[PDB]
Design a protein around this nucleic acid. Structure first.
Ligand SMILES: [Zn+2]
Ligand SMILES: [Zn+2]
Ligand SMILES: [Zn+2]
Lengths: 633, 595, 101
DNA sequence: GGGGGGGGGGGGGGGGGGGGGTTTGGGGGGGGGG
DNA sequence: CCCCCCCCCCACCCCCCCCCCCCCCCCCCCCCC
């Protein structure tokens, strides 16, 4: 099959010379050996494998040469135009110029050194008249081009649907959301075959999605002896590279009206693997390339990535200022009016009690009563403030759900077991909005959190319990739109009193129309709308990231029992039992006593003490007393 | 002047590797490991000065078993074998071949050194395996990379499922179509080295050999899907999974739902673009090729069996963290013992219902009992379907109760469960099996579970001015299915409330109680103690039932008394029922039947 | 099996069968050239009554009430059609490999 | 009497030709509302 | 408690392969030294 040919305005000999000149000369001299040769000494020490080339370095080198009065033939345009070939040129230049190691390596421990040394010895035995390898085999590093900064096409972040066929071969940059990521798998750069009948190994480089394996020994050792020896693949000696695929999709906002969102395959190789995860919003530089399916399949060979997204001294800045529990509680959602006792309890759920051996240490609160009053925003704010938090609703989060299951990926054919929200909330806190509406499986799921700190599986031959140690924050908004504000909650709420008895505290709150409290609430709301800042004075609202310092710091200040608290909490239980000597389900029980103990331990954590304080017990009892008096309405 | 056997690609002499391993396989003392690791202060001559792997090889020879389990860290203790640990981790197939052959060689060496009467022919026939383990850090499944591809690795994970056993040809068998001569070929790297001409020179016909499939010799292979645990994931995205190949008697060493370690060589293989072609896809499949697996006596038992407080001693141990409630704990202890069985129907089960308020600790007692029992289940009854609890639909899969076959089934919220689901539990309590008949599915599904129900009075509180039937609202004959029924109530009393609060608050002070010994003792009792009934028990059984029958009772109470008396007779390893067992069974029933 | 050659009406007979339907490789007539072109003589060839039945692990023996394991069983001759679906049976015979034909 | 050369058979290599490679309806099980 | 709903499950080029032909090698037989 004969081919025609044409002359073109390029020369890879001249550009190879330019590339090695750049490599052996350039440094970032505006910041005042060469950057690239020093980096290649790091490669030679086996301390580095990711060789990054900046197009800005190439541009600075071109400008330096042009300033010195010689044309650099705009290597930036060439690499932005036919990027894939210049990977080969850059790697050949490196292989022709990389300096020897400085740090010791124990060089014989690499199989490639032993096998190529043996081939060299055999070739010297031949060479006494009695390439050595394909270079990709010996090439340990991975080479990537990094785009131009703003100052050019590689710099511009294209949406996926702007990637047209004319860009094929160019080092473009794309922008979107990763909708799927592959597990890592190895791919052969060079296959190494042993030869059974002579021991002289032979090599095949692979440069496509498929190949055909070798059979007969092509080496002169066999071929000259006309000895038709058989070849066997060795994974020990074959060079593999890490491979991974990711599907990028344009952002949902970029989709024109009525169009389907367009998507693309990104292939990533070498050390750059597992730089991406699903749900990431990211800019990725790569070579936009065809693949064998006249319509070609197409993908992006990734090259560079831009994701869109001490303390133990710094906590002292808030500790030294004092009254930090009261202030931090007042910092919980300062845009929400009042209810400071509720906020003070919700903080203790993040701080937590003691678990011991078992003794169960999580702390749980239920909000109950009329809808609105910024409650859903408070639960969302808790999910924002708290570390290891998650927000749900009794019917929401309706994908993987709050309740766990065995599952397929029905878009493909494999099966997997995966956890629901209660497992993500493990070692943390789960917020249940619309708590009144959750079903029997959901209710038994939160039962299993409270009764085993797990969620169970009994399906498709798999019996397993997944770990779910987590605090519950919950919102039981009533039936029929409004509570009847003189009745027991069970005349207003769907949920069984059995479930409610497991919570450490319950706050019934009613949306009472009352001119005076209406005006106090309305003054707060209107002031927040008017002033745009400081939702109240003297609250000292701490910002989320700064208070996470103290929440994490407080969480680890585990207490030890004091005999004073042991007596005092026994007395506190007996005092509340006198009130229990009866008109609602807020009775004193061992679980309320445990709630007081855990709330007290969380207060001991917050006051940074080892000895738990009778003050902690009395304040824990105060929150329980306010809770019961709230429940009594 | 001589050839050298070299591990290919490594310059390791195999002969030197062999000697370096042999001199550790014999003459190694387990004290050397305590010199290598922590707990060096606890060297003890009578357990550490033995030639430890010769102790293993001799016990292994007496049992005649092929496997030597080998903790990899032991190689680093012995001076001549430290390098061989690194050789193993980096070149495991060859070093393991060496270790296998050396174990077989040492079995021969021991019988010929001792010039023993044990069969040399047995040792020569037997294949021998080393199973190396505890290689190093259990690096994550997500973290494996191309450098690992020939190394030994160790992974923690969850088994999703397994294949059936798969036959793998180890030797081919070729028979001549002309002259009926036969020859054997070992399979080399998955390739049949077929003879092109017949072996016999007096025949020597080409292409005359044919493969006699069922006279070939086969090893066993099994493939298992091992998942990254949901505990270790970055929780915003899925767990991974990896296929593993497991071989010979390591087949079926684990099952779906097992969390395990697997130690093996990491491996990779190409996969064909089309089976009609040699063409291969560029990215290889990967799997781990396993060499070891792990999950996640009577003298002591006899010493405890002589104690006089043993009834209370075992009763406290089930839940010392909860208030002592020792009639409940004693009843549960009898439920853990169980009765006996007779095949001519009846079963040696025991069934209990915890009534009382929702405001009490009975759920926590159920939680501990579910931990204590070997093979129980826990669930709850509100909204519990008659088929979901039992078995559900193509194939039928077992539900919670059937999965609790041979163990305690804890069910909370039992008072809220619908009469349909109770109607299924009728034949559990009466026959301990489920008599299904649906479209395509007819079966008597055996499910021998000792139910431990937890139930409540209807509404927020028990009414003390009413009997338990009028409170619980479940009908009387349903309560008569259970052996014991209990009230645990939240009623205010400053004495009980002080002592309970003290009992609970004492938990934070302190640094047979432990469940491990309790469940061992219950297990040994189940294996060893099967009480027969004496006439001194018969007389009180007949009398006591006739008493409560004219208190008004049924033979289900008498059968309950029999099963409880047999359970009581498993205490003190008594193994014979007598009057006192019946008296306590009857007496605890008198606490219940008052209603 | 018994076959007749397409280009001469000689007959091969008593051809032992592998797991594939198996045909003769050489014609018995030295005056004939043939390899692999045949017609089966049905009336001369010999057949066995054959019936595959699949079994699964017994309900009481499954270790924890999980999915049972399965096996394919072959009945031939007078043993065919004695078993039935849902029946619980003891078999004796040979454990064998079967290739992908 | 042994070794070379001539002639015929048998085997192996190389080339050429050929064939293969998702919607709709129905029953039964399971769960929810009047 | 009974009935209805709704959910599930199922029915043109390139490679391998085979056939045909031609040459080369190896053995046997006969002649020459
Ligand atoms: Zn070769
Ligand atoms: Zn033969
Ligand atoms: Zn013929």
């Amino acid at each position: 099959a004969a081919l025609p040919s044409i002359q073109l305005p390029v020369d890879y000999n001249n550009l190879f010379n330019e590339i090695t000149d750049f490599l052996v000369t350039f440094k970032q001299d505006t910041l005042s050996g060469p950057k690239y040769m020093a980096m290649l000494q790091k490669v030679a020490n086996r301390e580095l494998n990711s060789v990054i080339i900046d197009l800005d370095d190439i541009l600075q080198y071109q400008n330096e040469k042009f300033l010195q009065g010689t044309q650099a033939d705009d290597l930036v345009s060439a690499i932005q135009q036919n990027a894939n070939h210049f990977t080969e040129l850059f790697c050949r230049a490196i292989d022709n110029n990389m300096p020897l190691p400085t740090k010791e390596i124990d060089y014989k421990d690499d199989v490639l050194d032993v096998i190529l040394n043996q081939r060299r010895l055999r070739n010297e035995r031949m060479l006494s008249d009695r390439e050595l390898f394909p270079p990709n085999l010996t090439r340990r590093y991975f080479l990537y081009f990094k785009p131009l900064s703003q100052n050019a096409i590689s710099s511009k972040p294209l949406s996926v649907r702007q990637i047209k066929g004319d860009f094929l071969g160019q080092l473009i940059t794309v922008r979107g959301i990763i909708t799927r990521v592959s597990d890592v798998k190895p791919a052969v750069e060079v296959i190494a075959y042993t030869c059974d009948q002579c021991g002289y190994e032979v090599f095949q480089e692979v440069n496509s999605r498929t190949f055909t394996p070798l059979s007969e020994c092509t080496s002169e050792e066999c071929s000259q002896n006309q000895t038709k020896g058989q070849l066997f693949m060795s994974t020990r000696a074959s060079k593999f590279s890490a491979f991974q695929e990711c599907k990028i999709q344009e952002l949902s906002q970029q989709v024109p009206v009525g169009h389907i969102p367009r998507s693309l395959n990104i292939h990533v190789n070498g050390t750059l693997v597992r730089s991406l995860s699903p749900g990431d919003i990211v800019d990725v530089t790569g070579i936009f390339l065809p693949a064998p399916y006249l319509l070609t399949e197409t993908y992006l060979e990734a090259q560079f990535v831009r994701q869109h997204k001490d303390v133990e001294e710094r906590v002292m800045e808030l500790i030294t200022s004092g009254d930090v529990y009261n202030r931090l509680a007042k910092s919980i959602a300062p845009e929400i009016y009042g209810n400071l006792d509720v906020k003070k309890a919700l903080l203790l759920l993040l701080v937590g009690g003691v678990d011991k051996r078992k003794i169960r240490g999580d702390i749980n609160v239920c909000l109950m009563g009329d809808p609105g009053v910024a409650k859903s925003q408070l639960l969302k704010a808790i999910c924002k403030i708290s570390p290891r938090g998650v927000y749900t609703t009794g019917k929401g989060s309706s994908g993987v759900g709050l309740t766990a299951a065995v599952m397929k990926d029905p878009v493909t054919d494999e099966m997997i077991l995966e956890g629901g929200a209660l497992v993500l909330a493990d070692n943390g806190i789960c917020c249940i909005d619309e708590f009144d509406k959750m079903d029997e499986s959901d209710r038994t799921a939160i039962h299993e959190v409270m009764e085993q700190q797990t969620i169970s599986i009994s399906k498709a031959g798999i019996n397993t319990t997944l770990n779910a140690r987590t605090s519950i924050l919950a919102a039981a908004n009533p039936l029929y739109g409004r509570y009847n504000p003189r009745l027991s909650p069970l005349d207003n709420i769907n949920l069984p009193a059995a479930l409610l008895s497991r919570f450490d505290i319950l706050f019934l709150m009613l949306d009472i129309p009352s001119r005076d409290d209406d005006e106090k609430l309305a003054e707060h709301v209107t002031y927040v709308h008017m002033h745009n800042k400081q939702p109240d004075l003297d609250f000292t609202p701490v910002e989320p990231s700064k208070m996470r310092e103290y929440i994490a710091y407080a969480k680890t200040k585990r207490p030890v029992m004091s005999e004073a608290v042991n007596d005092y909490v026994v007395q506190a239980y007996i005092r509340l039992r006198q009130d229990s000597k009866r008109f609602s389900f807020g009775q004193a029980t061992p679980r309320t006593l445990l709630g007081i103990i855990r709330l007290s331990q969380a207060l001991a954590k917050l006051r940074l003490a080892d000895m738990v304080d009778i003050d902690d017990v009395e304040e824990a009892l105060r929150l329980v007393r306010v809770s019961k008096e709230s429940l009594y309405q | 002047s001589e050839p050298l056997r070299i591990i290919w690609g490594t310059n390791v002499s195999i002969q030197e590797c062999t000697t370096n391993f042999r001199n550790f396989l014999m003459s190694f003392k387990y004290k050397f490991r305590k010199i290598l690791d922590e707990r060096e202060e606890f060297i003890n001559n009578t357990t550490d000065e033995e030639l430890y792997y010769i102790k293993q090889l001799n016990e292994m020879r007496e049992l005649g078993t092929s496997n030597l389990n080998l903790d990899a860290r032991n190689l680093l203790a012995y001076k001549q074998t430290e390098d061989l640990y690194h050789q193993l981790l980096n070149y495991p197939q060859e070093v393991i071949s060496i270790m296998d052959q050396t174990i077989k060689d040492c079995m021969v060496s021991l019988i010929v050194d001792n010039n023993l009467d044990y069969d040399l022919d047995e040792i020569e026939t037997k294949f021998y395996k080393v199973r190396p383990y505890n290689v190093g850090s259990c690096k994550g499944m997500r973290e494996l990379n191309p450098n690992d591809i020939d190394k030994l690795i160790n992974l923690k994970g969850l088994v999703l499922r397994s294949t059936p056993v798969i036959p793998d040809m180890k030797v081919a068998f070729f028979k001549c179509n002309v002259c009926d001569h036969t020859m054997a070929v070992e399979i080399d790297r998955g390739v049949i080295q077929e003879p092109a001409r017949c072996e016999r020179i007096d025949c020597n016909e080409p292409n005359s050999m044919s493969l006699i499939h069922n006279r070939c010799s086969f090893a066993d292979k099994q493939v298992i899907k091992l998942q990254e645990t949901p505990d270790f994931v970055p929780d915003g995205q899925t767990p991974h999974s990896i296929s593993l190949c497991v071989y010979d008697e390591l087949v079926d060493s684990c099952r779906a739902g097992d969390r395990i370690e697997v130690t093996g060589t990491f491996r990779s293989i190409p996969i064909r673009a089309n089976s009609r072609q040699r063409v291969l896809k560029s990215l290889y499949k990967t799997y781990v090729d396993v060499v070891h697996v792990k999950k996640v006596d009577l003298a002591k038992i006899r010493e405890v069996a002589a104690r006089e407080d043993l009834y209370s001693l075992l009763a406290r141990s089930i839940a010392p963290s909860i208030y002592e409630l020792e009639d409940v704990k004693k009843g549960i202890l009898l439920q853990l013992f169980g009765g006996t069985n007779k095949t001519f129907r009846y079963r040696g089960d025991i069934n209990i219902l915890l009534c009382g308020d929702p405001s009490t600790s009975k759920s926590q007692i159920l939680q501990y009992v579910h931990k204590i029992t070997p093979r129980g289940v826990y669930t709850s009854g509100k909204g519990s379907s008659a088929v979901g609890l039992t078995a559900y639909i193509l194939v039928l899969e077992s539900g919670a109760l059937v999965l609790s076959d041979g163990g305690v089934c804890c069910i909370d919220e039992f008072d809220k469960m619908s009469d349909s689901t109770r109607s299924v539990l009728h034949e559990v309590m009466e026959q301990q099996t489920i008599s299904i008949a649906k479209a395509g599915i007819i079966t008597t599904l055996n499910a021998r579970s000792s139910i431990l129900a937890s139930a409540n009075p209807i509404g927020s509180r028990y009414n003390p001015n009413l009997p338990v039937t009028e409170n619980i609202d479940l009908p009387p004959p349903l309560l008569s299915r259970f052996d014991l029924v209990y009230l645990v109530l939240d009623k205010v009393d400053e004495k009980n409330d002080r002592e309970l609060a003290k009992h609970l608050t004492n938990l934070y002070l302190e640094d047979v109680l432990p469940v491990e010994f309790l469940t061992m003792y219950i297990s040994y009792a189940k294996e060893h103690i099967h009480p027969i009934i004496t006439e001194a028990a018969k007389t009180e059984l007949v009398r006591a039932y006739v008493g409560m029958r004219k208190m008004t009772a049924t033979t289900r109470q008498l059968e309950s008394m029999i099963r409880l008396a047999e359970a009581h007779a498993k205490m003190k390893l008594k193994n014979v029922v007598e009057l006192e067992d019946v008296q306590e069974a009857v007496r605890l029933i008198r606490s219940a039947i008052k209603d | 099996a018994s076959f007749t050659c397409d280009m001469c009406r000689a007959i091969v007979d008593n051809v032992e069968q592998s797991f594939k339907y198996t045909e003769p490789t050489f014609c018995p007539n030295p005056s004939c050239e043939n390899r692999a072109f045949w017609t089966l003589n049905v009336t001369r060839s010999r057949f066995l009554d054959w019936q595959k039945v699949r079994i699964q692990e017994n309900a009481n023996e499954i270790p924890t009430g999980s999915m049972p394991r399965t096996l394919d069983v072959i009945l031939r001759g007078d043993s065919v059609e004695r078993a039935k679906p849902g029946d619980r049976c003891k078999f004796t015979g040979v454990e064998i490999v079967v290739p992908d034909v």
